């Protein structure tokens, strides 16, 4: 249906949270159609730097999620 | 009457629809003000009542957050260990506020021997002119101390009498009645704002 | 048992490091939006009162009822046992559970937010460090590439308005040994506490005014206004505490109102 | 502007170094190269090396300029110049390696104008 | 655990190259943007110390959490399947972790440390708390920049150009550094830091450098060691007197500072007699 | 392994040739603009040690890493195809590439390396290390033109007076240059450094210049080698306290310097003969 990726954020403490890519901006959650897309995307997601904001642990987990065509 | 002018830098006034996350009002609160004037000096027989309430300068805000804890304390505990406890709190604070008030007083039921209008009025003289209290009067908040200057009329910066937008209904104050000494419970009486020109004025009941 | 109302004035400054970050923008050093200078609230500086209380008596009438776990691990009867036996709870009081008045105990001691002398500026170190957090993803292949944005002030001065009120005090029974343990705390409450974070924070002066009647005589503004802090013409960027200038003025305080030299 | 007499010593070097420079430019008008690769580099920590080694030679260039009045306002402003100064240092604070900088082009822009040199030497 | 609060004050100097340097601006040696002055932040001199212990000691009672390539979460739970761990329940199951992790690891014992990763085992605010470290009169760097007589890849034998291959290495000519350093007493209690481990921390600060060598970093090497050794367990004074006893002043002749006997050094023992008591290490 | 460790000071001298000069000011001498002293930076000096070596031992196990033109990741891809082909599953054959290439290529296993450009192969930190070094007294260029006789080009086909460009060429009286060397023991246990490739670097040092000539150095030299020999792994003493007892001053009597009996070296053996050694080198 809709291809896309699930994002989850480890903090210190052992809490954490979880929250789809693409509610940065006034654009939604983005879809897209081929698993090729998404896999494109976190690989270029995991291309740069990464710069940890406060009482962050470690770098992020994306996994690749298939939602139902909205 | 009475004319006195208070000021600070910040001031807070949370309304109730938002009591959480505290979000200020922009005016002073008629139901503040008699407490203002019972800090000076508080006699069991003496009930205030307060008239004129007189902005000076335009509103301002900020925003600020710290860590709280929500957690009444209680006998059969021993401690708190706040870790276990945090929840952070923002707040819409009011910034370099300065007000005049106009208001009166008088006797309650409890006249008491010394019953005096004199001179509860010249004692209050008094201590306005010296500088004395139970306790500085707050701002909304412990942690804003004001200062009280007794003036007679149009001694600090001219009143911003610019009209002014509305606020509609208002929190007025906290009746005592159904109440017994020391406040068992109280319900909350309200008034309407209406957007004074410069000077809101308190109507009694 | 104190009877006179007590005003006093406190200055304190730090060398390099976070006093306290906002928790709500990153952790940057809380700074007033239009004007470039930094607060400190109140409660970080009744923090470290408590943490130090708690750390240097350890006995019973010096219990804190507020603790961290880093640092160690008929309605009147109960009031007066309970504020007779910590010191935090009767000095700056506590609300009940229940009691005369939704619980409100006040306690005489107050404080007040601590601004800056002088318009104040940041510096944002980049850190970094050897190992990775977790082996997910592992970023073995050289991608333990992370930065941490550590943050800084060069340095500052800080004002301080601090009251008490003697009527709290009668009915929370606070003894003047109390207030002297209270001056000695605020004199050396930062040598107990060093953090990585926070850096050098020091105290430089403490002046203490102290009223004849219960009620007071003098208004508490020129009381304040009396002590003056300014910056030494010469320089336009400010380093040190030697840049600043320090003027007390007893001419008039002394009719009925005495000032002493705690601090230095 | 330009400062008659600023005095610290990099501005009067300066100077004195765009004045040799155009020295050098007129003596040889066929010419393109420029003394500035040669001597800047030199000229801002350790001037006691190659200021007197270029006066050395500074005689030639003046006389192999054509025009006789060219030669002598250049020589009594050089003259002018060299007042202020009394002893060529060996070495330089930073700010006075800059004013020297500073000097060098506010003389080049003095000179290249178009007759102020001639107003200066008729007064003289 | 120890006895005595103690407070010193540490002076180190570098020769020629870069002491710290931005990630952020190539690497800069970390400077103030106003007064000029270079910036040594404390993290890298803790990391120096680590590396130190590493070197030395290869026993268990002072390994170090943090290595040169290693899985932090890995070594949590690792420690946290022991006994005493696993028999109690989740409430005190953290505390236990944080008393044999302490047990453990030397570094943790010492500096601070945090743990809430995985299987949380608590945070430690640790005892030896150390500051920044300022540079005594402003500095300058030198640009320098190098060539490689090779290149990296075969995408091209020959440049568009010559080889570019242009290297930066910044170098730094000069300049005392100063830090100060507190010890805790009663956070001390908390974690066991014993007498013998402050005994094996001074030596390190005595002799940290030798044993930390590098391309960019340059000669270095650690002149000063002034330590204030408190009385009772509660301050005798504030701490500032103290760092303002001691103090170090360019002498007036020169005006480019590029030796020790450029600098003075004077130490402040007249009204002494307090029971603080002065111990002089550096020399 | 070597079972010592090392610390050592070089003193060489130019007599009239441009040293290293700035890739970037033309070609002029790296000089210290405040102070006005020369300055040779580290990677040139051992990139004359890696020629060195190249003329004299070609053989394997004295092979070279870096050479006059080659690709990096070739290299590298070449030991990725030794025996351990895939059998380390990239946990450690990262680790096994590393063995290998400081198994052959004696620069990798004397001086740090980098590589991990393609498929990565690790990193050295390198047990020998060298400072810049810098000129005891200041120096001052004399810059030259010169001319050819034939254009090298028809683009400027036509032949005048400013024609014929001269170029230029630079140079430098006199100098003498201090250079303070050390070496590492744990580190050399990590890359298999030798007690042979320590002799070997020695005659490296002594005799490097004769057998390195160009047109623009002129003759060079080396005036002096001292070598301060350890009792311990640990540090015995501190480096300042060894190398101030080699002092070099310029005599009194000349005010210009123009050569090495001008010069005056003092060494200085009070009492650190008692754990330490020095060994003359240079002599």
């Known amino acids: 249906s809709m291809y896309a990726i699930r994002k989850i954020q480890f903090f210190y403490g052992p809490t954490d949270k979880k929250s789809y890519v693409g509610e940065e901006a006034g654009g939604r959650r983005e879809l897209f159609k081929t698993r090729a897309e998404a896999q494109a995307r976190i690989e270029d997601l995991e291309e740069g730097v990464y710069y940890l904001a406060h009482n962050e642990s470690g770098r992020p987990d994306y996994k690749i999620v298939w939602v139902r065509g909205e | ?205 | 048992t104190i009877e006179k109302r007590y005003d006093f004035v406190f200055l304190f400054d730090v060398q390099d490091g976070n006093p306290n970050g906002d928790p709500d923008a990153g952790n940057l050093p809380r700074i007033d939006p239009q004007t470039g200078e930094g607060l400190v609230t109140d409660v970080c500086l009744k923090r470290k009162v408590r943490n130090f209380i708690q750390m240097t008596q350890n006995d019973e009438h010096h219990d804190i009822f507020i603790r961290e776990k880093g640092i160690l691990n008929k309605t009147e009867a109960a009031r007066q046992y309970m504020c007779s036996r910590y010191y935090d709870i009767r000095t700056f009081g506590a609300v009940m559970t229940t009691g005369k008045n939704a619980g409100q105990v006040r306690g005489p001691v107050q404080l007040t937010f601590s601004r800056s002398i002088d318009p104040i500026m940041t510096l944002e170190h980049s850190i970094t460090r050897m190992a990775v957090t977790n082996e997910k993803d592992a970023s073995e292949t050289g991608d333990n590439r992370t930065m941490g944005r550590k943050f800084t002030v060069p340095y500052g001065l800080y004002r301080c308005h601090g009251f008490i009120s003697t009527h709290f005090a009668k009915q929370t029974g606070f003894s003047e040994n109390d207030l002297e343990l209270f001056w000695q705390a605020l004199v050396n409450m930062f040598d107990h506490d060093h953090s990585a974070a926070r850096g050098q924070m020091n105290a430089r002066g403490l002046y203490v005014f102290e009223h004849s009647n219960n009620l007071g005589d003098a208004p508490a503004d020129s009381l304040f206004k009396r002590i003056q802090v300014v910056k030494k013409d010469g320089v336009e960027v400010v380093r040190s505490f030697d840049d600043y200038l320090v003027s007390v003025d007893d001419k008039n305080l002394e009719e009925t109102k005495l000032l002493r030299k705690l601090g230095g | 502007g330009l400062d008659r007499n600023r005095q610290d010593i990099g501005y009067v070097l300066g100077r004195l170094f765009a004045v040799l420079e155009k020295i050098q430019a007129e003596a040889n008008p066929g010419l393109n190269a420029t003394i500035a690769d040669r001597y800047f580099g030199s000229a801002s920590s350790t001037p006691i090396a190659v200021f007197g080694t270029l006066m050395r030679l500074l005689p030639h260039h003046l006389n192999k300029l054509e025009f006789e009045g060219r030669a002598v306002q250049l020589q009594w402003e050089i003259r002018q110049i060299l007042e202020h100064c009394q002893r060529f240092p060996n070495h330089l604070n930073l700010e006075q390696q800059g004013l020297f900088a500073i000097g060098y082009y506010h003389e080049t822009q003095f000179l290249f104008t178009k007759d102020a040199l001639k107003n200066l030497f008729n007064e003289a």
Request: aromatic residues 12%; glycine residues 4%.
């Open chain 2, 1 to 205: 009457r009475f004319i006195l002018e208070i000021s600070g830098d910040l001031a807070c006034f949370t309304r109730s629809e938002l009591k959480v996350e505290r979000v200020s009002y922009p005016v002073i609160t008629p139901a503040a003000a008699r407490n203002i004037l019972m800090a000076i000096l508080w006699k069991p027989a003496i009930r205030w009542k307060v008239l004129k309430i007189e902005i000076l300068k335009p509103i301002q805000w900020t925003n600020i957050r710290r860590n709280e804890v929500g957690t009444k304390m209680s006998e059969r505990s021993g401690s708190l260990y706040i870790e276990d406890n945090r929840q952070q709190r923002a707040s819409m604070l009011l910034k370099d506020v300065a007000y005049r008030i106009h208001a009166d007083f008088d006797m309650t039921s409890e006249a008491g021997e010394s019953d005096n209008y004199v001179k509860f009025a010249e004692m209050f003289k008094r201590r306005a002119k010296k500088g004395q209290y139970f306790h500085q009067p707050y701002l909304g908040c412990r942690e804003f101390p004001c200062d009280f200057r007794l003036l007679e009329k149009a001694e600090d910066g001219l009143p911003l009498e610019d009209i002014t937008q509305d606020f509609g209904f208002m929190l007025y104050d906290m009746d005592f009645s159904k109440s017994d000494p020391r406040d068992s419970n109280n319900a909350e009486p309200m008034f309407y704002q209406c957007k004074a020109v410069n000077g809101v004025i308190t109507v009694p009941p």
